[PDB]
């Protein structure tokens, strides 16, 4: 229902001369774009990554980003000189920008900046601001960045208008990929006077899934789900473990429910 669109930028500045900026774009948990430092242009990672933008709208948007990447790089380098010797290389900067799409024509846009892995700055309303916990020295950069009316006007338009418009078109164009159903496949195993049973579940999309160890109709509340781990083919992997006394594994089963199975649960008995 609700999809978050995330443009993620990672910038490493090793010293005065050396830097690289790499970007990836996500709609939900599917990658739509990639922009390597080595590349002059943004890469589509889906057929529908241009959304409903004409080639002229896309070119114009890409151009804006190309100017931004070069300008951003120089601005950081100059901001470091401005604050010296308070801050020094190496420096990591991350940006997380995009919008969250709600039913209607409702959306919330965001642009969050991290310095050395800590959220310190956002764009809010019509200006850059520091967030709670940020060090006081950032007040000078913020002042300098807020002097640039031109950037403020461009970012407002990107966040308020361009992002929701673009993503609406993406959702339309990419509907069949976003709504795909991929079936989980399960298999069982064990490791170490106690034993750990493992229910492996792999290849399911979308993410929501239910996995429980059973004895008949009784859920084993000792069941521990791990994290969702990605496969390379944009499906998910998950394992559920149950710690049990050895020679007690008789009549235990692993039950898996997922939207893709259409009522036919997977049940694997040990």
């Amino acid at each position, epitope marked *: 229902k609700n999809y978050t669109f995330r443009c993620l930028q990672m910038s490493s500045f090793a010293n005065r001369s050396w830097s690289r900026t790499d970007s990836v774009v996500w709609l939900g948990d599917l990658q739509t774009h990639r922009w390597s430092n080595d590349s002059a242009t943004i890469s589509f990672t889906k057929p529908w990554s241009q959304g409903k933008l004409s080639n002229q709208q896309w070119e114009k948007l890409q151009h804006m980003f190309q100017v931004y990447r070069v300008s951003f790089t120089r601005d950081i380098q100059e901001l470091v000189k*401005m604050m010296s010797p308070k801050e020094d290389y190496p420096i990591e900067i991350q940006l997380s920008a995009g919008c969250e799409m709600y039913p209607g024509n409702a959306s919330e846009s965001f642009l969050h900046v991290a310095f050395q892995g800590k959220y310190v700055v956002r764009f809010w309303g019509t200006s850059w601001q520091t967030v709670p916990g940020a060090p006081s020295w950032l007040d000078l950069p913020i002042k300098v960045l807020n*002097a*640039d009316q031109g950037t403020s006007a461009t970012v407002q338009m990107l966040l308020n208008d361009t992002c929701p418009l673009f993503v609406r078109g993406l959702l339309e164009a990419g509907k069949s990929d976003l709504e795909k159903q991929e079936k989980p496949v399960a298999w069982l195993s064990s490791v170490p006077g106690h034993r750990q049973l493992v229910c492996h579940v792999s290849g399911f999309y979308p993410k929501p899934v239910w996995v429980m160890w059973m004895r008949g109709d009784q859920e084993q509340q000792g069941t521990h789900r791990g994290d969702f781990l990605p496969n390379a083919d944009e499906t998910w992997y998950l394992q559920a473990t149950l710690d049990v006394e050895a020679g007690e594994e008789a009549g235990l089963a692993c039950r898996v429910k997922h939207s893709s199975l259409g009522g036919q649960d997977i049940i694997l008995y040990w």
Partner: T-cell receptor
Amino acid sequence: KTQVEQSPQSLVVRQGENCVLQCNYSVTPDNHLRWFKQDTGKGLVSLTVLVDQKDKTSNGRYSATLDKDAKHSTLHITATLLDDTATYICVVGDRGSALGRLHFGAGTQLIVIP
Amino acid sequence: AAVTQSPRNKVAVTGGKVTLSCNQTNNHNNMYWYRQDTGHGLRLIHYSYGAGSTEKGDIPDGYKASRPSQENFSLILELATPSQTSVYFCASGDEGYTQYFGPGTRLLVLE
């Protein structure tokens, strides 16, 4: 050879005549463009600053245009006077803040015959 | 916002030490040194974002910069050469893009 080019290099006009000065640039990004007047052996006097995609400004007898799509600016002097005898310099700022560098044209020399 | 330069005119010898000074009472953090030569636009030599900060510009070779205070920014030619015969312009600014130029300094380095 450079990112800001002015034309003509020089020109001679008679008092009361109008003239047009040109500035072409390749600077990116182009936040704004300023025209300077430099009397012989003197400093830089700002005539106008252009900021919009398709901008127009005026300052008495001086008027100016900017076309950011073409990266082109003209300075118009109406009814030249003797005191317009000067070098006219075009400058492009690449930021709307102090993080910017200025890119200076080499200038156009105007002589007004009284 | 006003900027002053001293000296306004200087004749020097090759190998001599020349210091060009710029004073600025606007409490501007940022100051900038340029030279102007016939056939060229102003070119950036050195700049400063504050007391103790000096940064290399586009053509820094043969020059040293010095920012002992918010008010004063100096350009030092340790071993003057005839190639440094020029007109030198200092400027100051705050966080905005405007640089406020001084009246210029003429330097002639004789053999």
